[PDB]
């Protein structure tokens, strides 16, 4: 009954991976967090009444192609594809992450959620409809999050968990 969900948060540098993760765990906004730190975190939550154990891997940059690093990622059951809305290139890298995720799990069917972060900014360079379209071509939801105001943070993570249930219960 006490079930485990292993989530991986991926994305380009500065998109808010550490920001979104720490908001979910420690319930506050970290201003300037070390970009190199890659850690796992654990949190007990109640999603749709079910008490769940959340293990989240907040990835940090230097992507590697050692076998163990692949083994490290295969442990992930869901993947938050995170980009910033004021970063045109972080959105262009989304497919570069999705291809690598499918490669390590060897599957065309991997639970993922597309996340546009920093939705509190007045300046925006990535249109919402532009990301709606890309999400449909993958079959995954799209969440408009802001780690600074904690808007849609739980919504984005909880959705990834729900996208995991509809995979082991098929």
């Amino acid at each position, epitope marked *: 009954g006490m079930t485990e969900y*292993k989530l991986v948060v991926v994305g380009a540098c500065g998109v808010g991976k550490s920001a979104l993760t720490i908001q979910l765990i420690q319930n506050h906004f970290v201003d300037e967090y070390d970009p190199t*730190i890659e850690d796992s*975190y654990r949190k007990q939550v109640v999603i749709d009444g079910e008490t769940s154990l959340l*293990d989240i891997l907040d990835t940090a940059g230097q992507e590697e192609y050692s*076998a*163990m690093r692949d083994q490290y990622m295969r442990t992930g059951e869901g993947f938050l594809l995170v980009f910033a809305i004021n970063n045109t290139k972080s959105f262009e890298d989304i497919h570069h992450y999705r291809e690598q995720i499918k490669r390590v799990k060897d599957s065309e069917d991997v639970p993922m959620v597309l996340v546009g972060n920093k939705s509190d900014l007045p300046s925006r360079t990535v249109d919402t409809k532009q990301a709606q379209d890309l999400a449909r071509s993958y079959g995954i939801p799209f969440i408009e999050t802001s780690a600074k105001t904690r808007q849609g943070v739980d919504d984005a993570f909880y959705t990834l968990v729900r996208e995991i249930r509809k995979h082991k219960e098929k």
Partner: antibody
């Protein structure tokens, strides 16, 4: 690349209390890992001391349980060791380490500090 | 040490050497075994995890296995750089603690 560095007195006189601190860099003390202390007498083998989780939960080597305290200080991103009533048998190199990953178990000691010789003498 | 290893092992270069580790039902019989390599003056380094899996930089010629209450480390392509101290470790259910073997100093002869 989380990094650990142990700091503490090099000499402790008996009845006294050995106190050591491990400063952690490149990684949060609040990650889902277990923070251990290990020691090694010079020329001899490794001996586990105890463990702490960031929630405060601990596990100690039973043979040392009555003398050992391990603490966590999140404000300084540190964990520490207190070993009371030291004797010559506590002369050793004391490593701090991180392991028991919870995301992907590699064992109890994934990353190690360098060491700092602690000599118990009169 | 709660686990048992021979204090020393020997091998001529190129040949295969074995390092044993004896436990009981509380530790090796019930739990995974991990192996660590320690060079002089440095902290130990993970060599084998979960009985037989290798981390990065650990070459093909290092292999582990576990049978019953006993474990074994095998080094085939024996090089001079393998001179080191080797330790097995496991969780002990009866003691509720991590336990080590006494360590084995490997000597490359010739």
């Amino acid at each position: 690349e989380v990094q650990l560095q142990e700091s503490g007195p090099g000499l402790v006189k008996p009845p006294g209390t050995l106190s050591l601190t491990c400063a952690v860099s490149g990684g949060s003390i609040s990650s889902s890992n277990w923070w251990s202390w290990v020691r090694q007498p010079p020329g001899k083998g490794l001996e586990w001391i105890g463990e702490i989780y960031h929630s405060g939960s601990t596990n100690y080597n039973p043979s040392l349980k009555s003398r050992v305290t391990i603490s966590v200080d999140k404000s300084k991103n540190q964990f520490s060791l207190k070993l009371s009533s030291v004797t010559a048998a506590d002369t050793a190199v004391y490593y701090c380490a991180r392991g028991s990953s919870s995301w992907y178990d590699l064992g109890p000691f994934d990353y190690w500090g360098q060491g700092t010789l602690v000599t118990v003498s009169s | 040490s709660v686990l048992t290893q021979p204090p020393s092992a020997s091998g001529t270069p190129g040949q295969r050497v074995t390092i044993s580790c004896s436990g009981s039902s509380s530790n090796i019989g019930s739990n995974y075994v991990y192996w660590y390599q320690q060079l002089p003056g440095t902290a130990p380094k993970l060599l084998i995890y979960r009985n037989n899996q290798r981390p990065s930089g650990v070459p093909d010629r290092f292999s582990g296995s576990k049978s019953g209450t006993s474990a074994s480390l095998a080094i085939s392509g024996l090089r001079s750089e393998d001179e080191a101290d080797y330790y097995c470790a496991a969780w002990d259910e009866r003691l509720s603690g991590w336990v080590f073997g006494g360590g084995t100093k490997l000597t490359v002869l010739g």
